[PDB]
Amino acid sequence: PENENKFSLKEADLKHHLEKNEEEKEVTPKMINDDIQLKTAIDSLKTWSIVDEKMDE
Amino acid sequence: HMFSRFSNVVSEIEKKYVDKISISEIMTKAIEGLLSNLDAHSAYLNEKKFKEFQAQTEFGGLGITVGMRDGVLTVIAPLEGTPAYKAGVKSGDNILKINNESTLSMSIDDAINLMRGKPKTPIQITIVRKNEPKPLVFNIIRDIIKLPSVYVKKIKETPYLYVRVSGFDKNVTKSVLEGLKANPKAKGIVLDLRGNPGGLLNQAVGLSNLFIKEGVLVSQKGKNKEESLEYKANGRAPYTNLPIAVLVNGGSAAASEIVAGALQDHKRAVIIGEKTFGAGSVAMLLPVNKDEAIKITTARYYLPSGRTIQAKGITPDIVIYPGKVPENENKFSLKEADLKHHLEQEEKEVTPKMINDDIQLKTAIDSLKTWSIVDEKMD
Amino acid sequence: HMFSRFSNVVSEIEKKYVDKISISEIMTKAIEGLLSNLDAHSAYLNEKKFKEFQAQTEGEFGGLGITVGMRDGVLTVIAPLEGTPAYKAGVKSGDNILKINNESTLSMSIDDAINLMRGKPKTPIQITIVRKNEPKPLVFNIIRDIIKLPSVYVKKIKETPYLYVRVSGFDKNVTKSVLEGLKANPKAKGIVLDLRGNPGGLLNQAVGLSNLFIKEGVLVSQKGKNKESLEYKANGRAPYTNLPIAVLVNGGSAAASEIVAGALQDHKRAVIIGEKTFGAGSVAMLLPVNKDEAIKITTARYYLPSGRTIQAKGITPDIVIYPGKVPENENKFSLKEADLKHHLEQKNEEEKEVTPKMINDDIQLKTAIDSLKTWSIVDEKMDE
């Protein structure tokens, strides 16, 4: 699902435009938003990290 | 001394103005002018208004709560039972006119003073809303604004409870604790603090003390060292091991941000939804002359981590916007049971139909299912 | 003494308010708060307002002359005005101000950038641009000049005996600029006067403009608490005492613009056309205080020649008309492209005149022109 405000869909994208990388080294937010099963798997890991930080006391 | 500039400006106003006015009326306009330019929350009370404020107990209300953002009056949230909730007012609406008075140069106290009254009395409001082409107009009939503050419901097919706290009024701590004693087999809580606009701090520390055993909950600071009050848990917390998920959504403010921020800083719960309103200030009333008073902001709230609520709010650990859950379209597909020669086999609760209608409540339950597995591993 | 009831409040706030503030700051908030509570139009002008008020009523300022409209949420230039040093330097429509030099002007509103841009009339400036069609930013070094932008201009209607004149605000140039504009056109047979959206200005320019067209009687009168009050009267001469006038007014027309429309209406000198005006009925006097600071305070109410006043109730038109495009003929041609532009074949300032297309785009302007046609017929009937 998406936020109804979405910065008014600004075409400038907060890009600075002041002027190469192997970016397939990393998974990116655009292709997490395209798969809700992948988002759900990451949000389960974020829950587990909190319970470890509680239980180490 | 410092009165030189002011004495000159008052002498011109006394000489060169359209109407006759007394020096008394100039001093009153200077007091109200200073406070209106100081902060959004201050006000001046003459003897008639101060005696009225001391004499009144309350009576009839509209149901909205309002606050300043970027120089404009905005709705924080309407309370669920109220005439304004039923009429279709929403969070983040801007108030343009109240009963044919324009909201330019108007304080939060002036807006509240226009809205309150007694039952069956009508009112009209003109509102600006984010995606609309023109101003909206609403007509509403005022009422006694009374509703149950809390309820506890079981969820079908699961060992988890849903707890709703709609505003921090009196007896919230008892109403939650009796709901937990009524369900001794439960294995986790969802706390729904969405659209909860505030209430009294004595219940926000009271609720937090059910779940946290030790340490600081919240504190008040001002420029003065003395009266820097600090709140700490009393060691009697009954439920120190129970799983919790908390929902917040940008109509949440004040007392609801103290509960969410204390549970988050103690690593005691998971916070889910979208960023809160950020209302972190306290104000109090001071007598100044013979039988008259001022109200001014006096302190700000600070969390256990030393962060402050004003005007950042609380950010959730898991972000998710409103909407309905996805659905199984690909119903026809092949399985082992379809193959030719396979080897053989050897009303008063939250229902699945409710959980499918908002994905935020689904995400809270999925977090509790992760927590139950981690406990079962560690045991 | 008289100030004790205020002095107690300023003592209590100083020890109990959340933050540290000085008595110089409290007194500054009390002064700006007091003048803002006398009426709707009184105010306090600190040095970074009083200089702008002075520049606006002179009609000129030191600066670049690039018009910025904050498009795309950033400092996008929309139009350079011709002959300004920024136009000479070649910054153009669609250019976005990335920095002056080191300030990240993507991050902020007009308020500081326009102050850096509107510098003194000699010291040159470096400006940093991105032009969205180019893979590289642009940098300009720009010399200073005063922008001297006009508040009034005159045009001819293309096919017709009538002038269009627009007055945008009552600064010191108005009365002389209208008189020269009529002297430059001796063949003209009527005026459309466009006061739509004009917020007011100097009182002497409202009285001075009304005196080009009227020959006898009071133009405006003033009153206040002390019987010290004034009447302004026509000086017995008028260059243009006979020709037709149609005046356009709108809900944004206020104050000094309602003095000239009210004076022409009460003496039957013109026809008033459009929508009901703003309704501001008072005069403010401006006084210097300290140094480079001023106070603006309401000193009188004003009255029109018949003794009526408009305070909180605007001028009402003779002819009422809301904005829109004209209707069109259904039997018109099947999009013949002006008959293939009718070349007849074997870079000009067309803005010297007003076109049929830009008249069809405004029914209030059409209605004002069609009122002048009726007056010309009644003069040709009566000239026997």
Side-chain angles (χ1 to χ4, degrees):
Chain A
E2 293 198 285
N3 185 337
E4 63 271 20
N5 302 277
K6 206 182 168 71
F7 314 97
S8 76
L9 196 74
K10 60 187 179 184
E11 298 286 17
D13 199 25
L14 204 67
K15 185 173 63 174
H16 306 293
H17 192 65
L18 304 178
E19 298 187 359
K20 185 177 177 181
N21 191 270
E22 302 306 319
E23 293 288 18
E24 290 302 328
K25 75 197 201 307
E26 278 161 323
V27 177
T28 68
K30 180 180 173 70
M31 70 183 182
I32 293 171
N33 294 344
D34 285 352
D35 188 0
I36 197 166
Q37 301 187 321
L38 178 57
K39 185 177 185 293
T40 301
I42 299 164
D43 295 343
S44 181
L45 291 171
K46 289 190 291 193
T47 304
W48 195 324
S49 302
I50 292 165
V51 186
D52 282 355
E53 288 187 318
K54 187 187 185 297
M55 294 298 182
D56 79 17
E57 293 181 352
Chain B
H1 69 307
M2 293 150 287
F3 278 77
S4 59
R5 285 164 58 194
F6 187 77
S7 302
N8 295 343
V9 173
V10 170
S11 75
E12 307 308 341
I13 294 164
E14 173 71 340
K15 289 170 62 70
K16 296 182 180 290
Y17 180 64
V18 278
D19 291 343
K20 186 71 65 69
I21 62 173
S22 68
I23 193 65
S24 178
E25 290 159 293
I26 300 173
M27 295 302 103
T28 293
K29 288 179 181 291
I31 291 167
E32 292 186 326
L34 172 60
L35 270 53
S36 306
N37 213 131
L38 185 70
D39 66 9
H41 308 90
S42 54
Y44 160 70
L45 292 165
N46 64 42
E47 73 307 306
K48 185 179 182 288
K49 297 184 71 71
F50 187 24
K51 289 172 61 69
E52 180 171 30
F53 175 85
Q54 289 183 30
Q56 72 188 13
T57 172
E58 309 319 296
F59 288 75
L62 173 61
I64 71 177
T65 300
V66 294
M68 283 277 284
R69 292 290 95 140
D70 61 288
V72 181
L73 275 81
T74 67
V75 181
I76 297 182
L79 195 163
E80 296 192 349
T82 65
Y85 184 91
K86 290 172 165 66
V89 186
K90 283 180 163 64
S91 296
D93 287 340
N94 296 7
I95 311 301
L96 193 75
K97 300 163 64 79
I98 302 173
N99 206 11
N100 202 30
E101 176 71 313
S102 181
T103 64
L104 293 183
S105 74
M106 195 166 78
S107 75
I108 296 167
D109 192 60
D110 303 312
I112 294 165
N113 292 334
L114 289 170
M115 291 174 200
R116 73 167 177 280
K118 65 181 171 69
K120 311 300 296 288
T121 315
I123 191 163
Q124 178 179 112
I125 294 98
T126 303
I127 267 154
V128 176
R129 181 172 291 173
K130 192 70 175 184
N131 294 322
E132 298 298 340
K134 288 187 169 72
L136 275 52
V137 179
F138 299 88
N139 297 287
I140 312 94
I141 295 173
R142 290 177 272 186
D143 201 1
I144 50 55
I145 64 168
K146 188 62 166 66
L147 186 76
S149 52
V150 175
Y151 58 80
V152 182
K153 296 172 73 169
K154 291 172 67 76
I155 305 172
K156 285 195 177 185
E157 305 184 6
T158 52
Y160 306 128
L161 301 178
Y162 176 81
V163 181
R164 179 60 173 146
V165 183
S166 190
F168 288 84
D169 298 330
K170 63 184 171 72
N171 301 340
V172 165
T173 302
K174 282 287 182 69
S175 187
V176 175
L177 180 59
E178 293 303 327
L180 297 181
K181 288 190 299 182
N183 294 281
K185 293 186 182 291
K187 297 189 180 291
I189 290 168
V190 183
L191 272 168
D192 195 350
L193 303 183
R194 295 181 289 178
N196 178 321
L200 83 176
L201 178 147
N202 178 255
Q203 293 292 330
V205 303
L207 186 67
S208 306
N209 196 77
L210 296 182
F211 305 122
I212 294 163
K213 195 192 293 181
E214 298 192 337
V216 67
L217 295 170
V218 74
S219 64
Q220 290 177 351
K221 301 288 182 68
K223 67 185 182 182
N224 296 310
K225 184 59 165 64
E226 192 51 86
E227 311 172 32
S228 299
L229 298 178
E230 177 176 79
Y231 299 96
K232 288 160 57 78
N234 67 21
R236 302 200 304 274
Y239 301 120
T240 195
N241 294 308
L242 185 66
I244 303 169
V246 186
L247 288 156
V248 301
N249 80 331
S252 313
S256 68
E257 297 179 286
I258 292 173
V259 177
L263 295 172
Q264 193 183 43
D265 278 0
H266 282 288
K267 298 283 175 168
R268 183 61 192 93
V270 186
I271 312 303
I272 300 169
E274 59 184 320
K275 193 174 67 73
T276 64
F277 188 70
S281 304
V282 66
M284 62 186 289
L285 187 156
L286 309 172
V288 291
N289 305 316
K290 62 183 184 178
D291 46 276
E292 67 183 332
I294 68 176
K295 177 186 174 185
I296 56 170
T297 311
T298 298
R300 294 177 185 105
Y301 288 114
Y302 284 82
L303 297 181
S305 54
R307 298 183 292 151
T308 183
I309 306 171
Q310 191 193 34
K312 296 178 172 68
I314 306 301
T315 50
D317 308 314
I318 295 165
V319 181
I320 179 156
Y321 303 109
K324 303 184 72 176
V325 306
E327 183 60 289
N328 184 19
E329 293 176 23
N330 183 30
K331 302 186 194 298
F332 301 106
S333 282
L334 202 68
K335 291 294 198 296
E336 179 80 349
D338 290 18
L339 307 188
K340 190 66 173 77
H341 297 289
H342 70 75
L343 304 180
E344 70 275 14
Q345 295 202 49
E346 62 173 23
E347 182 172 40
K348 64 186 300 290
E349 296 182 303
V350 180
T351 73
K353 192 177 64 70
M354 298 174 70
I355 291 164
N356 278 257
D357 283 351
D358 69 319
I359 194 165
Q360 292 184 338
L361 180 59
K362 195 215 185 300
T363 301
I365 305 165
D366 295 348
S367 305
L368 288 167
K369 290 183 175 182
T370 301
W371 196 325
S372 299
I373 289 165
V374 181
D375 284 349
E376 286 171 20
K377 184 188 184 296
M378 297 299 182
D379 293 342
Chain C
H1 66 75
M2 300 172 292
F3 298 174
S4 63
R5 64 180 289 86
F6 170 85
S7 184
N8 293 345
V9 171
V10 53
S11 74
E12 194 73 357
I13 186 183
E14 182 185 309
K15 61 184 64 180
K16 287 181 183 290
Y17 183 62
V18 202
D19 298 325
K20 181 66 176 178
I21 57 177
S22 68
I23 306 94
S24 179
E25 191 63 18
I26 294 166
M27 292 300 183
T28 302
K29 290 181 178 183
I31 286 169
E32 293 185 22
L34 172 58
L35 283 153
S36 305
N37 274 272
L38 297 179
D39 72 350
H41 294 297
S42 303
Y44 188 86
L45 305 177
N46 66 296
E47 67 96 33
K48 197 44 174 170
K49 296 181 182 64
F50 186 33
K51 287 169 178 172
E52 306 302 338
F53 173 91
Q54 187 178 8
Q56 183 167 19
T57 54
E58 292 269 39
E60 64 193 31
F61 60 90
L64 297 181
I66 38 166
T67 312
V68 173
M70 206 169 174
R71 296 304 88 193
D72 305 342
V74 295
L75 300 186
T76 304
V77 176
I78 311 303
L81 68 97
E82 294 186 337
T84 205
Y87 166 93
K88 191 184 296 289
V91 52
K92 287 291 295 182
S93 304
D95 289 348
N96 171 35
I97 310 170
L98 185 80
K99 312 183 185 181
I100 281 67
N101 194 62
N102 204 36
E103 318 70 20
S104 188
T105 53
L106 302 183
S107 68
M108 182 54 188
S109 187
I110 301 297
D111 295 345
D112 59 350
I114 208 78
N115 186 340
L116 297 173
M117 293 157 66
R118 295 171 68 252
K120 290 287 294 187
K122 292 191 295 286
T123 307
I125 188 161
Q126 183 162 266
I127 303 294
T128 311
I129 293 301
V130 291
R131 181 173 291 174
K132 71 188 301 290
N133 195 48
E134 189 78 349
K136 295 286 293 189
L138 304 177
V139 179
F140 298 86
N141 280 265
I142 312 177
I143 64 178
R144 296 298 191 177
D145 201 1
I146 62 179
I147 285 61
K148 199 180 176 82
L149 75 181
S151 57
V152 49
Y153 62 77
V154 179
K155 295 185 182 178
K156 292 156 59 77
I157 307 303
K158 268 183 68 72
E159 76 283 9
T160 285
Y162 306 136
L163 301 172
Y164 172 87
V165 330
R166 200 298 190 257
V167 185
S168 189
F170 287 81
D171 76 76
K172 71 192 288 170
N173 300 278
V174 172
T175 188
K176 194 263 186 172
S177 301
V178 171
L179 178 56
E180 293 295 296
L182 296 179
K183 283 166 61 184
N185 294 281
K187 277 68 172 181
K189 298 184 175 69
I191 296 158
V192 178
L193 224 178
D194 192 350
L195 302 177
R196 294 182 286 176
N198 181 317
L202 296 173
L203 181 65
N204 300 305
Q205 296 293 319
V207 177
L209 184 68
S210 305
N211 176 240
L212 295 183
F213 304 126
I214 294 164
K215 212 185 187 296
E216 180 60 282
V218 297
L219 300 175
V220 72
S221 310
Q222 296 186 10
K223 216 182 303 293
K225 65 177 171 68
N226 57 315
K227 303 191 75 178
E228 73 97 325
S229 177
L230 287 171
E231 298 190 335
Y232 295 85
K233 292 178 71 177
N235 62 6
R237 71 186 70 92
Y240 292 114
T241 194
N242 290 306
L243 90 174
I245 305 175
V247 184
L248 286 157
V249 300
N250 182 20
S253 300
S257 69
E258 300 177 285
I259 300 180
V260 318
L264 291 171
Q265 190 185 59
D266 276 17
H267 284 176
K268 300 298 193 291
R269 184 60 191 92
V271 187
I272 312 301
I273 303 182
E275 306 164 60
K276 203 175 187 179
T277 65
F278 192 90
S282 65
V283 181
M285 186 170 187
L286 186 149
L287 304 175
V289 296
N290 311 325
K291 184 64 177 181
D292 304 336
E293 295 173 329
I295 74 177
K296 173 186 170 186
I297 187 161
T298 303
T299 59
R301 279 167 280 244
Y302 77 72
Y303 301 88
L304 299 182
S306 60
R308 66 196 271 232
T309 191
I310 69 171
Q311 178 56 30
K313 55 189 294 287
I315 285 173
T316 191
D318 301 311
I319 297 162
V320 179
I321 178 64
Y322 299 105
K325 296 189 174 68
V326 303
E328 295 192 349
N329 182 5
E330 67 281 359
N331 296 334
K332 72 178 183 171
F333 310 97
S334 191
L335 305 180
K336 69 176 183 187
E337 307 194 324
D339 195 5
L340 311 183
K341 301 194 295 281
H342 199 63
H343 294 284
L344 308 180
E345 180 62 304
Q346 185 169 8
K347 207 173 183 178
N348 187 47
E349 193 179 351
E350 298 299 327
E351 288 301 329
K352 290 180 294 188
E353 302 194 308
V354 185
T355 75
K357 185 175 179 289
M358 74 199 296
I359 290 167
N360 292 346
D361 290 340
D362 188 359
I363 198 165
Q364 301 187 320
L365 177 59
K366 173 173 167 56
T367 302
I369 295 165
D370 292 337
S371 179
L372 294 168
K373 296 176 183 165
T374 301
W375 198 325
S376 301
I377 290 163
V378 180
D379 275 357
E380 285 188 327
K381 170 168 164 53
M382 294 296 180
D383 79 7
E384 295 193 324

